[PDB]
Design a protein around this ligand. Structure first.
Ligand code: NA
Length: 129
């Protein structure tokens, strides 16, 4: 599913992401925009053989199992296919673990390169929240 911006904001808010680990909602919406364009089914292959899955592009080397990433971990206890669902629950639950891993939202490269230090409140302006 391809979310609209304020639709995703609302979904994220309901699943407890606003101000999780001190990151406001706009940070997550911004991260999702530039990681996936709000497209739950997004996948991307990396040079190391891993793949990123879903609306926040969560990586199979550490968080999910794709059966094709040697020697990898599955820190979130989920098939990487669970990350492509129109229901964002497994993505949001796994995201919460990742942001806790010590580097905060810097794990999402597009957050660091395109959202961090910007007025990310823009991303939820207009939204009935
Ligand atoms: Na894995």
């Amino acid at each position: 599913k391809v979310f609209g911006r304020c639709e995703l904001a609302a979904a994220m808010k309901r699943h407890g992401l606003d101000n999780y680990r001190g990151y406001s909602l706009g940070n997550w919406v911004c991260a999702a925009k530039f990681e996936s364009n709000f497209n739950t089914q997004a996948t991307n292959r990396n040079t190391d053989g891993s793949t990123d899955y879903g609306i926040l592009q969560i990586n199979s080397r550490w968080w999910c199992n794709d059966g094709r990433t040697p020697g990898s971990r599955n820190l979130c206890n989920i098939p990487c296919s669970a990350l492509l669902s129109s229901d964002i629950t497994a993505s949001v639950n796994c995201a919460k673990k990742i942001v806790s891993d010590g580097n905060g939202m810097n794990a999402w490269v597009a957050w660091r390169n395109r959202c961090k230090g910007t007025d990310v409140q823009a991303w939820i302006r207009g939204c009935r929240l």
